[PDB]
């Protein structure tokens, strides 16, 4: 849907992100730029152009590039909300 949930088996993620509140760029959120071929992210259905919305409940819809990078890097069971537009 316009917004979806992806259950990554956290335990490397095989994905690349671009954007942020200060470095907002085109694929004003933090957007998925690349996804490795065999990476966990690709197996889990995460698509290029998806704007990451939240990481295990922590919203990134308006978060610094590094703030989002740290969110995806410390989810502590993992769930990522995305915006497919």
């Amino acid at each position: 849907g316009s917004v979806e949930e992806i259950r990554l088996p956290r335990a490397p993620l095989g994905l690349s992100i671009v954007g942020g509140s200060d470095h907002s760029s085109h694929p004003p959120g933090v957007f998925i730029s690349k996804v490795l071929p065999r990476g966990l992210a690709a197996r889990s259905g995460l698509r290029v152009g998806d704007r990451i919305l939240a990481v295990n409940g922590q919203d990134v819809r308006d978060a610094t590039h590094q703030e989002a990078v740290s969110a995806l890097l410390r989810p502590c069971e993992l769930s990522l909300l995305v915006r497919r537009d």
Partner: peptide, 10 residues
């Protein structure tokens, strides 16, 4: 868009 396109692979 703006400039300084930063990308981070996780």
């Amino acid at each position: 868009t703006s400039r300084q396109a930063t990308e981070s692979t996780v």
